[PDB]
Design a protein around this ligand. Structure first.
Ligand SMILES: CC[C@H](C)[C@@H]1NC(=O)[C@@H](NC[C@@H](O)C[C@@H](Cc2ccccc2)C(=O)N[C@H]2c3ccccc3C[C@H]2O)Cc2ccc(cc2)OCCCCCNC1=O
Lengths: 99, 99
């Protein structure tokens, strides 16, 4: 689908059997979801953005369905203001910026 | 043009007579430019991102040319690690997300 940017590009995703709303973020290298219980082993990690660095739990090969499109990749879980879909998963569903 | 997301979506912009490299960010509500001496009156502001908040100076009606696309709007100047072109300016150049 073609998404204009007048409003925040928030879409419904499905992860861990749960449906959530996430922001399609082209400025985020990785995908960071709000604290939740995800199956499997996780590795402590530190990511940085605007405002500072935060500690996250890194999960690998996590299946995520974005607007009906399937992706399987790394998902970081931590104290984020909003669920973010980064370039690691955006490239999987073939998302591009057009103008 | 069509920009893929394998790497960070960096483009050349023109602001205040200077050519800069900025990141096309669909996850940013506003546009944040690295510290530069822009003339005119500004309003102090605090924007929140991933690791917290940072203080910026808000300039309005600033002309910014994005890859040959003339746009004009609010620009926040602060200690950002990278120039960020937000939705306020992306909507003006007709930018969309497609997948
Ligand atoms: C610059 C971003 C502005 C300040 C902010 N947006 C973000 O921070 C949004 N994402 C910001 C990123 O697109 C910016 C982008 C800028 C950058 C780029 C390269 C190197 C350093 C910093 C970044 O942080 N990127 C980092 C990131 C984010 C998530 C996961 C991994 C990583 C790694 C790194 O790329 C998420 C958000 C947060 C609070 C929100 C709403 C959305 O509250 C609600 C809105 C609050 C007011 C509006 N604020 C925003 O739109």
């Amino acid at each position: 689908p073609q998404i204009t940017l007048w409003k925040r590009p928030l879409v419904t995703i499905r992860i861990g059997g749960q449906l959530k709303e996430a922001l399609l973020d082209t400025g985020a290298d990785d995908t960071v979801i709000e604290e939740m219980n995800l199956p499997g082993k996780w590795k402590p990690k530190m990511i940085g953005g605007i405002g500072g660095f935060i500690k996250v739990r890194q999960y690998d090969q996590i299946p995520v369905e974005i607007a009906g499109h399937k992706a399987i990749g790394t998902v970081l879980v931590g104290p984020t203001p909003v669920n973010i879909i980064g370039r690691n998963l955006l490239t999987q569903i073939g998302a591009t910026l057009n103008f």
